[PDB]
Amino acid sequence: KVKQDMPPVGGYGPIDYKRNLPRRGLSGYSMFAVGIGALLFGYWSMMRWNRERRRLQIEDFEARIALMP
């Protein structure tokens, strides 16, 4: 008969050993640019809302002071 030992048609195809750890492109300083940007949004909006809340504050004190007598 023939022999049943293993090796097949040669090569088993290619195999990739070498190291790969790629792909993060979002990082220049521009990460700072987007974060600091987010701050620049927060202070804008929050500024507005605190102004509004002061307006309400004066209005409430007006309620009280009109009550006082």
Partner: protein, 103 residues
């Protein structure tokens, strides 16, 4: 024993011996690294990689007929060559082990 006994193993024995030599080296290295993590902190990598190690012992169990300590090595060459269809599994593990170690 071979060296002192003036014998050479046949080539295929030497090749199998090399194969499982570097496989075993893959074992002891992956252990050393992972357990070095678990000791220090880092509960998880122990788990991720010792899964693959379990695949390795899945190889040994076919090869030598037992899990870990089974000899499968003698003087004058190894005995009980690979079961038919083993090198396929070896290939398949070796295929993506690269991906996982990079992980």
């Amino acid at each position: 024993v071979e060296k002192l006994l003036n014998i050479q193993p046949p080539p295929r024995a030497q090749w199998i011996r090399v194969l499982f030599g570097e496989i075993t080296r893959l074992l002891n290295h992956i252990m050393a690294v992972t357990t070095h993590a678990l000791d220090i902190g880092a509960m998880t990598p122990f788990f991720w990689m010792f899964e693959e190690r379990e695949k390795m012992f899945e190889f040994y169990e076919r090869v030598s007929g037992a899990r870990m300590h089974a000899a499968y090595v003698r003087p004058g060459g190894v005995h009980q060559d690979l079961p038919l269809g083993l090198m396929d599994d070896i290939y398949e593990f070796s295929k993506n082990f690269s991906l996982r170690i990079d992980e």
